[PDB]
Amino acid sequence: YNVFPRTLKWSKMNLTYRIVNYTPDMTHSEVEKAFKKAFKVWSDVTPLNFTRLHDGIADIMISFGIKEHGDFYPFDGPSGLLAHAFPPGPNYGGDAHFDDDETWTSSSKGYNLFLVAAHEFGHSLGLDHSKDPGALMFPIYTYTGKSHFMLPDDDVQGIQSLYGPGD
Ligand SMILES: COc1ccc(Cn2nnc(-c3cccc(C(=O)NCc4ccc(C(=O)O)cc4)c3)n2)cc1
Ligand SMILES: [Ca+2]
Ligand SMILES: [Ca+2]
Ligand SMILES: [Ca+2]
Ligand SMILES: [Zn+2]
Ligand SMILES: [Zn+2]
């Protein structure tokens, strides 16, 4: 016999993702690089590994859409909800959707896709929102302006509570 797992986490360390479609705002390459960097944030502090697929069903299916886009979490035009993602699991679990009514950039203008992706992949991996305003998993986008990205300790603690450290 088997019982359902108690914790919403991935029970495998080698996970896949797929970019189902792309935003007008950035090149394919820029979008691909943003997501690769976002996943590296989490793999740097856990035993998790991430591979991109060009077809089929990946664990983490990534898409861009607006307003109603095929679930109970419709988008709302510029600002507000920037994106959403499902907790670990089969099917919809882990999937991440980005609001293409946002202006996506790789800078301090509009919303930084790497930054939002890093937050959403946190949800995809099992993290809910933090109550710490400085944490990456705080609900509200608050660009620091700082030169290089460093994952705040609250988010390291959170993710390592599910998966432990990389080594
Ligand atoms: C929904 O999407 C959301 C995304 C983020 C938050 C909360 N949140 N807002 N900012 C930070 C947050 C947390 C920790 C650091 C920073 C930050 O700005 N670092 C500077 C930086 C950013 C991007 C790049 C790059 O592009 O290479 C380089 C450097 C931001 N966490 C909330 C929601
Ligand atoms: Ca999935
Ligand atoms: Ca929005
Ligand atoms: Ca757009
Ligand atoms: Zn959605
Ligand atoms: Zn969130």
Tab-separated table of C-alpha atoms and ligand atoms in Angstrom:
chain	number	residue	atom	x	y	z
A	1	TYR	CA	0.000	0.000	0.000
A	2	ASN	CA	0.925	3.680	-0.364
A	3	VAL	CA	-0.265	6.838	1.431
A	4	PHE	CA	-0.136	10.379	0.074
A	5	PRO	CA	3.012	12.333	1.088
A	6	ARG	CA	2.505	14.848	3.935
A	7	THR	CA	4.809	17.630	2.624
A	8	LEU	CA	4.304	19.435	-0.704
A	9	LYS	CA	7.838	18.908	-2.035
A	10	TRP	CA	9.483	17.139	-4.974
A	11	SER	CA	10.485	13.576	-4.082
A	12	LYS	CA	13.168	13.637	-6.823
A	13	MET	CA	16.268	15.861	-7.023
A	14	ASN	CA	16.506	16.127	-10.831
A	15	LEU	CA	13.661	18.265	-12.179
A	16	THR	CA	12.704	19.477	-15.658
A	17	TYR	CA	11.173	22.645	-17.051
A	18	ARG	CA	9.782	23.736	-20.422
A	19	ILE	CA	9.061	27.148	-21.913
A	20	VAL	CA	5.710	26.608	-23.664
A	21	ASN	CA	5.567	30.114	-25.152
A	22	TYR	CA	7.406	33.434	-25.009
A	23	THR	CA	6.771	37.122	-24.259
A	24	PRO	CA	7.037	39.854	-26.984
A	25	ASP	CA	9.157	42.008	-24.664
A	26	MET	CA	12.377	39.975	-24.673
A	27	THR	CA	14.219	37.650	-27.094
A	28	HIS	CA	14.018	33.854	-26.671
A	29	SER	CA	17.601	33.904	-25.434
A	30	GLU	CA	16.934	36.589	-22.786
A	31	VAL	CA	13.907	34.695	-21.482
A	32	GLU	CA	15.849	31.398	-21.455
A	33	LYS	CA	18.769	33.016	-19.574
A	34	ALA	CA	16.455	34.654	-16.979
A	35	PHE	CA	14.875	31.266	-16.146
A	36	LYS	CA	18.243	29.481	-16.040
A	37	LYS	CA	19.536	32.112	-13.569
A	38	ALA	CA	16.310	31.905	-11.513
A	39	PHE	CA	16.682	28.125	-11.127
A	40	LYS	CA	20.397	28.495	-10.241
A	41	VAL	CA	19.337	30.615	-7.234
A	42	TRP	CA	17.680	27.516	-5.748
A	43	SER	CA	20.121	24.833	-6.984
A	44	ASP	CA	23.014	26.793	-5.414
A	45	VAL	CA	21.606	26.105	-1.912
A	46	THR	CA	19.868	22.686	-2.353
A	47	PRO	CA	20.640	19.269	-3.902
A	48	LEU	CA	18.124	20.085	-6.686
A	49	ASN	CA	19.129	20.092	-10.382
A	50	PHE	CA	17.214	21.614	-13.318
A	51	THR	CA	17.081	20.647	-17.026
A	52	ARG	CA	15.212	22.463	-19.810
A	53	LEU	CA	13.133	20.448	-22.281
A	54	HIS	CA	12.015	21.623	-25.740
A	55	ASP	CA	9.000	19.256	-26.000
A	56	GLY	CA	6.837	16.921	-23.907
A	57	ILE	CA	5.667	17.366	-20.329
A	58	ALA	CA	8.223	18.885	-17.956
A	59	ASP	CA	7.717	18.910	-14.196
A	60	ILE	CA	7.594	22.712	-14.336
A	61	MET	CA	5.617	23.938	-17.355
A	62	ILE	CA	6.206	27.659	-17.991
A	63	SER	CA	3.926	29.934	-20.055
A	64	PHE	CA	2.938	33.550	-20.709
A	65	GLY	CA	-0.734	34.607	-20.822
A	66	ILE	CA	-3.200	37.374	-19.935
A	67	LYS	CA	-6.516	37.659	-18.061
A	68	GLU	CA	-8.240	34.235	-18.212
A	69	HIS	CA	-5.635	31.707	-19.352
A	70	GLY	CA	-6.999	28.282	-18.295
A	71	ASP	CA	-7.142	28.070	-14.483
A	72	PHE	CA	-8.762	29.702	-11.406
A	73	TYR	CA	-6.021	32.372	-11.147
A	74	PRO	CA	-6.741	34.891	-13.921
A	75	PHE	CA	-4.421	37.865	-14.444
A	76	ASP	CA	-5.322	41.529	-14.099
A	77	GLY	CA	-3.451	43.763	-16.591
A	78	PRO	CA	-0.336	45.795	-15.706
A	79	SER	CA	0.979	45.472	-12.111
A	80	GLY	CA	-0.942	43.660	-9.332
A	81	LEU	CA	-0.463	39.948	-9.942
A	82	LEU	CA	2.761	39.595	-11.958
A	83	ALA	CA	2.729	35.800	-12.105
A	84	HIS	CA	1.601	32.724	-10.151
A	85	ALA	CA	2.786	29.117	-9.672
A	86	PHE	CA	1.465	25.823	-8.313
A	87	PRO	CA	2.935	23.854	-5.361
A	88	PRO	CA	4.939	20.661	-6.122
A	89	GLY	CA	2.911	17.749	-7.485
A	90	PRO	CA	1.814	15.986	-10.683
A	91	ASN	CA	0.054	17.747	-13.589
A	92	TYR	CA	-0.461	21.459	-12.737
A	93	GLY	CA	1.847	21.075	-9.745
A	94	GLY	CA	5.021	23.126	-10.139
A	95	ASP	CA	3.758	24.996	-13.223
A	96	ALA	CA	4.460	28.741	-13.465
A	97	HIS	CA	2.429	31.360	-15.403
A	98	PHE	CA	3.602	34.916	-16.136
A	99	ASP	CA	1.344	37.870	-16.917
A	100	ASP	CA	2.127	39.124	-20.418
A	101	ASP	CA	0.373	42.418	-19.619
A	102	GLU	CA	3.569	43.230	-17.681
A	103	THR	CA	6.558	44.931	-19.255
A	104	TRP	CA	9.247	42.267	-18.807
A	105	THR	CA	12.895	43.319	-18.699
A	106	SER	CA	16.334	42.253	-17.540
A	107	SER	CA	16.807	45.596	-15.744
A	108	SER	CA	15.255	47.912	-13.120
A	109	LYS	CA	12.595	49.070	-15.641
A	110	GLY	CA	9.175	47.385	-15.636
A	111	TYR	CA	9.454	44.022	-13.889
A	112	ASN	CA	12.697	42.014	-13.913
A	113	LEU	CA	11.754	38.576	-15.284
A	114	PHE	CA	14.653	36.780	-13.513
A	115	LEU	CA	13.483	38.235	-10.181
A	116	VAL	CA	9.811	37.277	-10.614
A	117	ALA	CA	10.822	33.843	-11.973
A	118	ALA	CA	13.065	33.266	-8.935
A	119	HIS	CA	10.071	34.049	-6.671
A	120	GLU	CA	7.615	31.850	-8.662
A	121	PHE	CA	10.040	28.907	-8.778
A	122	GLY	CA	10.134	29.220	-4.973
A	123	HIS	CA	6.403	28.392	-5.042
A	124	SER	CA	7.040	25.640	-7.618
A	125	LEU	CA	9.515	24.099	-5.127
A	126	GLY	CA	7.185	24.288	-2.088
A	127	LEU	CA	7.643	27.744	-0.525
A	128	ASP	CA	4.698	29.950	0.398
A	129	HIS	CA	4.981	33.708	1.068
A	130	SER	CA	7.272	35.183	3.724
A	131	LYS	CA	6.188	37.908	6.153
A	132	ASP	CA	9.739	39.376	5.992
A	133	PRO	CA	9.759	42.441	3.669
A	134	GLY	CA	13.391	41.684	2.621
A	135	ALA	CA	12.814	38.050	1.650
A	136	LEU	CA	12.580	36.963	-2.006
A	137	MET	CA	9.307	35.197	-1.076
A	138	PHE	CA	7.674	38.386	0.275
A	139	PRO	CA	4.393	38.858	-1.752
A	140	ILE	CA	5.302	42.264	-3.206
A	141	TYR	CA	7.985	43.105	-5.777
A	142	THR	CA	10.550	45.466	-4.197
A	143	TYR	CA	13.670	45.840	-6.393
A	144	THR	CA	16.642	46.756	-4.154
A	145	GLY	CA	18.738	48.320	-6.947
A	146	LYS	CA	21.848	46.510	-5.688
A	147	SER	CA	24.529	45.402	-8.168
A	148	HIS	CA	24.453	41.618	-7.631
A	149	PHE	CA	21.673	39.285	-6.492
A	150	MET	CA	22.104	37.393	-3.223
A	151	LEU	CA	19.414	35.047	-1.864
A	152	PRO	CA	18.265	36.343	1.569
A	153	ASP	CA	18.786	34.009	4.564
A	154	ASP	CA	15.020	33.658	5.177
A	155	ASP	CA	14.591	32.030	1.748
A	156	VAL	CA	17.694	29.827	2.219
A	157	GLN	CA	16.263	28.650	5.570
A	158	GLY	CA	12.865	28.055	3.950
A	159	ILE	CA	14.085	25.978	1.008
A	160	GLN	CA	16.598	23.990	3.089
A	161	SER	CA	13.743	23.059	5.482
A	162	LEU	CA	12.304	21.005	2.615
A	163	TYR	CA	15.432	19.715	0.816
A	164	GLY	CA	18.488	20.375	3.027
A	165	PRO	CA	21.726	21.914	1.697
A	166	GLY	CA	23.506	21.078	-1.581
A	167	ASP	CA	26.348	19.509	0.394
B	1	LIG	C1	5.977	37.966	-7.872
B	1	LIG	O1	7.335	38.272	-8.173
B	1	LIG	C2	7.968	38.750	-7.027
B	1	LIG	C3	9.341	38.875	-7.043
B	1	LIG	C4	10.003	39.338	-5.922
B	1	LIG	C5	9.290	39.680	-4.785
B	1	LIG	C6	9.958	40.180	-3.548
B	1	LIG	N1	11.240	40.756	-3.879
B	1	LIG	N2	11.333	41.907	-4.561
B	1	LIG	N3	12.638	42.109	-4.677
B	1	LIG	C7	13.247	41.052	-4.048
B	1	LIG	C8	14.679	40.960	-3.976
B	1	LIG	C9	15.321	40.156	-3.058
B	1	LIG	C10	16.701	40.116	-3.030
B	1	LIG	C11	17.449	40.876	-3.908
B	1	LIG	C12	16.789	41.672	-4.816
B	1	LIG	C13	17.504	42.507	-5.787
B	1	LIG	O2	16.910	43.419	-6.350
B	1	LIG	N4	18.814	42.174	-6.012
B	1	LIG	C14	19.512	42.949	-7.013
B	1	LIG	C15	19.506	42.310	-8.361
B	1	LIG	C16	18.333	41.976	-9.004
B	1	LIG	C17	18.366	41.386	-10.250
B	1	LIG	C18	19.573	41.129	-10.865
B	1	LIG	C19	19.634	40.505	-12.200
B	1	LIG	O3	18.661	40.704	-12.983
B	1	LIG	O4	20.666	39.824	-12.453
B	1	LIG	C20	20.742	41.465	-10.222
B	1	LIG	C21	20.707	42.052	-8.977
B	1	LIG	C22	15.416	41.719	-4.855
B	1	LIG	N5	12.390	40.163	-3.527
B	1	LIG	C23	7.917	39.556	-4.783
B	1	LIG	C24	7.248	39.093	-5.896
B	2	CA	CA	3.736	20.246	-13.514
B	3	CA	CA	-0.675	41.919	-13.663
B	4	CA	CA	4.263	42.408	-22.467
B	5	ZN	ZN	-2.395	30.509	-14.366
B	6	ZN	ZN	4.191	34.698	-4.744
